[PDB]
Amino acid sequence: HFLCGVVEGFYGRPWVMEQRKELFRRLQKWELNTYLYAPKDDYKHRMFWREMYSVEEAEQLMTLISAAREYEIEFIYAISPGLDITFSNPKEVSTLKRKLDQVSQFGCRSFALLFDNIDHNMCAADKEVFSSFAHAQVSITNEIYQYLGEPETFLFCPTEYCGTFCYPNVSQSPYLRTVGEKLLPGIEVLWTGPKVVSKEIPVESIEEVSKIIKRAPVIWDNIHANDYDQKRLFLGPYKGRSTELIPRLKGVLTNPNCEFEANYVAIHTLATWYKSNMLYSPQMALKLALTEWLQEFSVTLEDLQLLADLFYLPYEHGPKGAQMLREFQWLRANSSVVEKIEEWRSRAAKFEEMCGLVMGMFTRLSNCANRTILYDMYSYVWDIKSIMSMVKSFVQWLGCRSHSSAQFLIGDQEPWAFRGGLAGEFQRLLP
Amino acid sequence: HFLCGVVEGFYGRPWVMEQRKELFRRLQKWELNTYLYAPKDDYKHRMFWREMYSVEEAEQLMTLISAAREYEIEFIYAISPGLDITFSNPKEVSTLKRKLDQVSQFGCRSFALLFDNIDHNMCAADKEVFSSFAHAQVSITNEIYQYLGEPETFLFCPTEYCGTFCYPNVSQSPYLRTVGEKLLPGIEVLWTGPKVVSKEIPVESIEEVSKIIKRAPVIWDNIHANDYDQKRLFLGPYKGRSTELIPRLKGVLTNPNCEFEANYVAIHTLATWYKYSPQMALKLALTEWLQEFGVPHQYSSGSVTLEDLQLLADLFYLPYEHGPKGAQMLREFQWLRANSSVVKIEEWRSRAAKFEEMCGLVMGMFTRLSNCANRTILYDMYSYVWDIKSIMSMVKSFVQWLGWAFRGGLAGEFQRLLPID
């Protein structure tokens, strides 16, 4: 099998079950197949990894694992003991087994152990029993693979899980060396790209890592992750990944935006890029996703086209976003010119209009019917809507300068002219 | 009966019924009395306001109004119809009456009509029927009052609902004179103070407004309101309103942070103030809040402190004011940056050390907040505490390097370009 779908792998508030069930639906509807359960701040997945699900918790996990099986979505349950486990101690291993057992008993056939984002050193007891940190991680993963009866799907996210993070480089690293040789070939390996959130996964790099882990990796794709940035939301097409990868990978699971209803484009487009090569056009995919999405929401396609361009991708805005920026950077740069300058006025009118569209998009989203979709994006949409007002009104101001020398702020304000609070202040002092 | 409580009056996601029920337990526990239902973006409160509650929603609301009664909290159902209402069409009016009735039959004994943040003009049909904008609100308000039967509490939120919003000024306002004189002496007038988010609500000003409206107002307070800035949370004490205001006011209803669990200080302290030092009142509130944290139960084998909560509050304090520990770190970082050119200077290194340790405590605070049992509390503040800890790591780094390209995204890019940041 080639695994492709979603890892609920982000920091912060996890999705509730009825969200996760509506996801299984969509994974099927768009011919995707897998779901890795690994939400960082569901306490029993990581911080209290030793703890057995309670009775009422168990029923929920079980009813969830049901809805997955019902929808032919392959539920992988993960656990992240990386933080504080003593790898060398037999009682510690027994807990890990016992817990994995407990979930097996809900339905779960597929499993996963994640060792991302943890201290590279280990305790006293482990230094004796194990030559290297890598030897320790592979040991208990093996022992656990064999204990569970060697299941069809069983993943291992390493500590060195992207290019930037391998000491000293990908090919020369003791850690990824050890994992390739010593880690059982029935275990898959998770990889995020050259970096944690990757702009591009070039084919050259996936070969460079395929050799050292001795297999075709499974990609945890942080492309639409938004848990690192309070103001950021990613509605862009699945992009920067060559279809030409598919053959050379065992899967791609996209770790997407925390806000559930904003992952429509993020998954729908991952679907078209899986389906295309079981080449592919990011700009086309987007148009397909945005037209289909619009059925769910009076809000227009142009509105959504704008929205997605305003909140596009980690390393790239969308056309209408990037152009609005260009013009505003031009308009303020050449503003000292208040014959020969009919240009600034006619462009400042073009601009003040495109600002008017962002206002209208917001009016129309707030009058929409799908409140689940409204609430998940409200604070993102209000922010752009309102920065654009201050921008539009600041271009206005630069214009009415020919015949005024009032300040840009009229006296004493409401708070929301001085944004970001303390965080905001600290940030404006970094260079 | 003086009104004191919370108005769920904010833009964005509204609170769920399981939360609103929790609100009622607390309001009773702290001897507060009112709740004003007014969440701007709850479907049928405003946008689709004419539309009547489905039978499944009618069930949920009746269960809510009941829970309000169970906890001896008065429930005031408000409606905001002022966007697209034709004030003279009797189909409009009869669709309002019919809605209010629908709520009335869920229990609701008290009501409110909200005309805030709406176009100061009206369609040509109403140009005919009423002389000014005031007159049309006053008329449909006064009728709906009598129609329902003059209930004990009925509230009206004006369009000129604060000092800055009055034209030309507070006292000589056409609009406010028309409300004062012609609005039935039984109903009540809402008022947010000098400004929308008043840093201070001084006594003089409440007299200046009480005259022009012929009555003592009910304060819709936006001191702890959060909806206007995606990165701001407000956990500091109720402040800037003299206890002398109580004799001159019919109530205070605080419109607080969108994140439910984040409002324990804002309301705890309002209730303290209802019976004042805001520094004392916080300690009282933080000390009591701390018990809600806990650490999960464990059948196998670092817990949040009061010093932690004091730092959390100080970093997310009030709209016009940072808390002391926030202010201090920001002073110390301003001194370290501006004296980075001195790399006799043991002082910079001893203050570098102390600030790097101040930074550490912020990271410690998130670590402990992450390991706590109350996950409701953790989820509601997560993206806020995350942000502060990550800026502080970047700042800790940067201070050590004396011895975020796309950050904020498009919004952030445009915002850096405005020359007022």
């Binding site: 206002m359 007002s389 409401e414 | 833009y11 966007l83 805030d116 943040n117 709406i118 176009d119 929308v196 936006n222 206007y228």
Partner: peptide
Amino acid sequence: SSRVT
């Protein structure tokens, strides 16, 4: 319009 606080 905009129609906000």
